[PDB]
Ligand binder design. Sequence first.
Ligand SMILES: NS(=O)(=O)c1ccc(N/N=C2\C(=O)Nc3ccc(Br)cc32)cc1
Length: 282
Amino acid sequence: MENFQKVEKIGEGTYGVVYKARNKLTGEVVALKKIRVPSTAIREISLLKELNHPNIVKLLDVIHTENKLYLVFEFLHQDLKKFMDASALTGIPLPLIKSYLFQLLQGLAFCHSHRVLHRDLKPQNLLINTEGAIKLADFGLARAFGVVTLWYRAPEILLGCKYYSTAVDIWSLGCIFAEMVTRRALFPGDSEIDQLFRIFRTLGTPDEVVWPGVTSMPDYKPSFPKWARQDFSKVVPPLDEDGRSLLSQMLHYDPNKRISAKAALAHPFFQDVTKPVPHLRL
Ligand SMILES: NS(=O)(=O)c1ccc(N/N=C2\C(=O)Nc3ccc(Br)cc32)cc1
């Protein structure tokens, strides 16, 4: 709407372009999401305004004028993807990784308890500020509306399960956890089958033993090659035993055996968690 002056194009999300904008009246800086309108979408989005948590990017306003749909969110200056790029040579300090992971799990714990899923977690969706905080952006939009990155997609999704659960977010989070530690995407697939195979080649091809019902998945093929599971110490060095233990539980094949956000918060890996301040260059 004309109540804002598009400062700059920040990014091109999944449901539209995101702009840094200044609210004429208030003068506050915000993130304007222009979505290119179904009745259900409107109600669903409306519910998200109530979803308030310190680690969730706040949805301030929903502008539905002239049959257009604009979403106004709070603004943060940097995403995790850029921060990781800037730390590519020295790597993010373990205390900070531990802090970010802990906060993200709190955010997820909150959303999951409300039956709201993110469905598309990725480094680009994680925003940070100068004060050591990190927040989940785009939460709940997937459900609302319905080259994309498949790197963080859970296996049940890739195998055709249409009624997936909160467990998919934990998988995505596990992949991100591994990436921060090693400074390399864990499963960088370039197609659905390529994604599935990179997963199988590291965690082993799933069978009815480790994942009951897997052979009945819609896209499961008896012809899938059968790879053996690799040792985690080789996959995420030099993460300590607590960390590897936590990661393996986040990457369980069976959605039901995958650790929940809430249980993850009580893992020994977080015994010594603190809240460091990152040195951000804006
Ligand atoms: N790559 S970067 O320059 O660090 C950069 C800087 C700022 C953002 N922030 N964008 C966003 C922001 O502030 N609030 C949001 C709510 C929903 C969505 Br979807 C994106 C945002 C994203 C990327």
